[PDB]
Homo-oligomer: 329 residues x 4
Amino acid sequence: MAVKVAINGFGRIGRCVARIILERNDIELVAINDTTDIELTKYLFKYDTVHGEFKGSVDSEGDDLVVNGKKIKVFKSRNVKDLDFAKHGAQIVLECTGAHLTMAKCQEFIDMGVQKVIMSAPAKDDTPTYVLGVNSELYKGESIISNASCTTNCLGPVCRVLQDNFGIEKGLMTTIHAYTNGQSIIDAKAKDKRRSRAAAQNIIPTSTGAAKAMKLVMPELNGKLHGQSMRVPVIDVSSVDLTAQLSRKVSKDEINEAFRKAAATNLKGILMVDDDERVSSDFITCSYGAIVASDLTQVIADDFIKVIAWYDNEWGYSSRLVDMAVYIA
Amino acid sequence: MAVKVAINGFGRIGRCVARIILERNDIELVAINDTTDIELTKYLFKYDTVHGEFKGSVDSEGDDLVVNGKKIKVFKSRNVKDLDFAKHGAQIVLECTGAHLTMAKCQEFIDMGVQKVIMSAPAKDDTPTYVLGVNSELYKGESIISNASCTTNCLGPVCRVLQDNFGIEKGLMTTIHAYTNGQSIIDAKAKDKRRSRAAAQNIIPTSTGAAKAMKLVMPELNGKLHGQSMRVPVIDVSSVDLTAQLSRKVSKDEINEAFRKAAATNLKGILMVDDDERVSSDFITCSYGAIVASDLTQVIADDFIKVIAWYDNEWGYSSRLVDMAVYIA
Amino acid sequence: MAVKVAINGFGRIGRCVARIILERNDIELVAINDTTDIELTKYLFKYDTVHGEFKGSVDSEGDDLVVNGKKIKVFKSRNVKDLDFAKHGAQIVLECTGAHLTMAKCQEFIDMGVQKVIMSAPAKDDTPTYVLGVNSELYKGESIISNASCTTNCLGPVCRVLQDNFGIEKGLMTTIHAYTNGQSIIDAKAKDKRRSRAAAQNIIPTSTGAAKAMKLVMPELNGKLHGQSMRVPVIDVSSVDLTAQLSRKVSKDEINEAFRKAAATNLKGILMVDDDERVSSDFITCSYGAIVASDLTQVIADDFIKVIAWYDNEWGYSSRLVDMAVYIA
Amino acid sequence: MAVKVAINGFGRIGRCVARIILERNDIELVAINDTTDIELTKYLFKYDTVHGEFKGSVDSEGDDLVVNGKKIKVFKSRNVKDLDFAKHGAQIVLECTGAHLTMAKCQEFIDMGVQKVIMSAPAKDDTPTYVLGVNSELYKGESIISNASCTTNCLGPVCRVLQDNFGIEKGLMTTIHAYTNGQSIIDAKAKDKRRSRAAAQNIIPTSTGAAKAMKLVMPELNGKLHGQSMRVPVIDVSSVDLTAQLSRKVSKDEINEAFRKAAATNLKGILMVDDDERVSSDFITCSYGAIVASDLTQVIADDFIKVIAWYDNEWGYSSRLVDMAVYIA
Ligand SMILES: Nc1ncnc2c1ncn2[C@@H]1O[C@H](COP(=O)(O)OP(=O)(O)O)[C@@H](O)[C@H]1O
Ligand SMILES: Nc1ncnc2c1ncn2[C@@H]1O[C@H](COP(=O)(O)OP(=O)(O)O)[C@@H](O)[C@H]1O
Ligand SMILES: Nc1ncnc2c1ncn2[C@@H]1O[C@H](COP(=O)(O)OP(=O)(O)O)[C@@H](O)[C@H]1O
Ligand SMILES: Nc1ncnc2c1ncn2[C@@H]1O[C@H](COP(=O)(O)OP(=O)(O)O)[C@@H](O)[C@H]1O
């Protein structure tokens, strides 16, 4: 039978995760929680500036969303103590609030009968971290895990291929990243100077720990990677720009062939290669965590390389969260 | 001597008001309040995506902003009871928080020794409303007033000219309006459905009461005007699109000549006429409340007219708030 | 059997028209022409920033595009004399170049064996003009016709309903319009001052004759309508903002009910009513020529009304061109 | 006396170059050429979406632009044979057309009495290439030179400092670059697939030879650098993202101190360091070729570094062209 899941937090990730679950037979959505009334929940689920209109009926009956005739319980509580997800059948909670990123906070779900919690972001403690195609084979049945970040689910698969074929001595990453709800529409108070600046009218440097944290899913890369983000005025879709020194001389063609081989085998459904010279909008609603743009791969002086890989920072990660629920179930 | 003022709320309006006060000799800024630490206050005041870098030194000494060597007291309190503006010399409070739009709330400033409060938005009670060039001549020395909205300070001057020259039987307004901090950067919870949608990637209908509320500053227009807003992906600058039936036959040339005449006389510094076929960006940091685009003026069937007037929805209104402080002082 | 058509001009309209023809059984695409090599034709047809990836195989075999295994002849000639569309079976030419908008120019297609030409824009001569749901019933089998503009196929259906139910005395229209290939990406030479200005960073007034030209499809509106356009930074989807004086007192509810009634009957598939408070992105790839936003309908002083109707300025018009080929065939 | 110059090509670079010349006393603009009538020349020079309104009078008298009362001859000819710049006093021609990037083409100006030509882009032949602060000291009085690209005038100064202090073994560059007139406003035919895609709605990979061509101004870097561009939806301002392996271990602080030292000495007016955490809009109309964002400087594993440096891709380069005319005069 299909694993039954609940989504805590009905934001960009939570709603993309719900749409993907509704497309599949191997997982079933039984409950959600946000701080939104049901009329706004329905409206944001039905209509999406980025991913288009949900095809199918989006109704309500009290505090049930009814999607293509199936009832989904809607809670509306900031407090984990009021969220009896397991009473509605939930085996796994997808933790999409950004607010509960320690095992201590997630333990309440397990206490209330949930079997597993998956954090939709890097843990703030030493919660075990798993990324499909990267270290998912090492999963030991832990109750609480992190699925890392959207960037990790792009950079991670790229590093898996480079490490396994050539070896990584060191590297630095820039993500050219879509703006997010963490940013300001106009110059206004936010958690730091640069995030306070108008997101759709600037290139905005922002931090990411995605690269240093690769040590969690690839311990061989401990101390060998750092990175940063440059937020640009697109609503969705981002790129990993990885510059690395490999352990031996390689060619562009060799690098791209290694990616196409992984795309057909160990990273099927996870990493693909673009040989059509697409641009960012072409990857809107793409389920792959990494799309290597083969023509952009560069090598200089034998061992010094650049790889550009696209990711739908919403849909790729959301697809991995759903894949990860099915896998650990 | 220059009137001494304080700004409550250091947002888009509050910071534009502060820059304009610093350009003038007839008014002096002695204090501000927001909920922001001083490092972020300085950064947002110095650097502006829309209006460019402040020319001149922006320093701090404890909880004083120091601008071109002059000290400005910075409070940081949500509660009007902690804001002794008058202790720092403030005669007028420019109420730029959006949070204190009744005489009851503003009365606390007067109780604590402020002589006058000007609301930076339409009042939610029957606080007297004044708009320069429209009904400012009727000011009776009231302690608490509203300066109405950015839209009123565009529509109002346009209606003054049309009413005084031709007569207005009825009309409907659309503002093609820049996005604002009331809107969402990505599809996310906001106070209504349409405001929840990504502001820089949509045309977004939104309400404005600016037209019905014209009855406050032009009672002859009671029951004769309604309007609405269409929010579009520009960071700043908006247009009033007024369609009206006048009391007699007019020509395009007659309408435009009436506007140029007011621009030279009763609406000097308030309404101007564009005869250069400018676009919206050309009015960034323009102090005029209304810029009639003369070539866009239309008449059909004798008495049925359209006027398009630009406004820097930040700078024009901010310039009027400062003008209004000087005028009532 | 399905009417066989050719598309001259493989731009935004030409490629949307081709995608719609490929979705339908009652019309078949046999040939296209542009000034583009086949590799770029394939790329622009397959990948679309606005309407998303074409689902299905896009290949070539010499100067045939092969779409889901069907061969489409691709010409590459500026000169109508080199375009033997009828030799590849074409009965109707959809004239999507913007360059051949007189009967004199289109006569060459008829001379070379084409039975009918439909211009994808208003005629520059007295070519008969037809708009579905507006005056299509009057079609007399003419060989060469204009389908008017994207704006006419929105305004036209709106006026049909208002005229037939209430009567139109006079009105003025503004379209809040997506930027187009007629505009400049950065401030650079174009055919006029305002079109020379950066399209994605300005509100840009531009002319439209759509309103005065309504006399071609609704002669009763001769001398009663004018309009103008305000180009705003969205890539696609526009709105008609019609302000009109009707022949009698009406209510908002009466106006909206008249539109829903036409939506179910005489304007089925042509005009619909939005009762869900959508924004512009929600109408991307919508086939309706007009989507009345019911909650935005306004009436003041009995007879003075405003109607806001969305249109996918690419897809709605393209859907009408295809409908018009099927209808006249 | 001030060097007298002419501008061939009145585009983004040509008009920014003209505004900078008008701010300075050491150079004088005597003539321009474009393919634009005088009314449009005046309009585009006076009003600028990016750099704001020209302060001062912009008039015409026949085929003279009159700027703050000074007459500038305006030619309007595609053919260098009709451009007697030297007859109007021009000693140096700033070649801003993008169309004359070989010594053979520029020789006609010298034949017609011009003393020096500076190309506003990389040469397509072996025209000598000079970049201020990088190899300008080696200038030998050549008649025809290239000022390289906007990217070279950012990357070049950054490499000068890194090479002189630490040594560069190898590196790869990405520019996160503002869209340009080389790109399409909507999906439409351009010179390649990716440039055909809507510039304000995509991240668009594009080539730059700026890095390999560094061998022209720094021969020690022959074979050690490659790069690429990612075009993003900002109208202006770009960043060099340089990842390099240096000849020895360095620290972040050491790298940033080397840049501040060059900023005060050998690269005064050319490279500066941002210690204020600015974003892209803050560098609009900035004259520096490179603005190193000090907080973004990264080092991993001793010798593997990343430097992010902003550049106003219009104003920085234009300022260098004017500096280069003054220098070689
Ligand atoms: N404690 C909480 N309980 C429930 N929902 C929460 C809580 N904290 C945040 N949320 C919701 O989580 C969502 C976060 O979504 P959003 O801001 O779009 O970002 P993301 O890109 O991570 O999905 C929002 O709907 C927000 O209201
Ligand atoms: N009660 C309050 N006390 C102090 N500052 C406040 C209060 N409420 C809101 N503010 C501030 O008022 C400002 C509103 O600015 P912003 O959101 O940019 O909008 P506006 O366009 O009206 O200026 C913000 O700086 C906000 O933090
Ligand atoms: N004479 C011509 N022959 C063939 N194709 C033409 C001719 N003139 C223009 N075109 C093509 O017609 C198309 C117009 O499309 P576009 O500029 O996107 O505008 P629209 O919005 O009207 O479709 C382009 O592909 C252009 O190359
Ligand atoms: N042969 C030519 N003679 C004169 N002007 C030319 C010629 N070729 C191009 N131009 C002009 O050169 C300018 C190039 O400017 P633009 O496209 O904005 O790009 P850039 O970013 O390089 O300045 C335009 O004004 C164009 O009309």
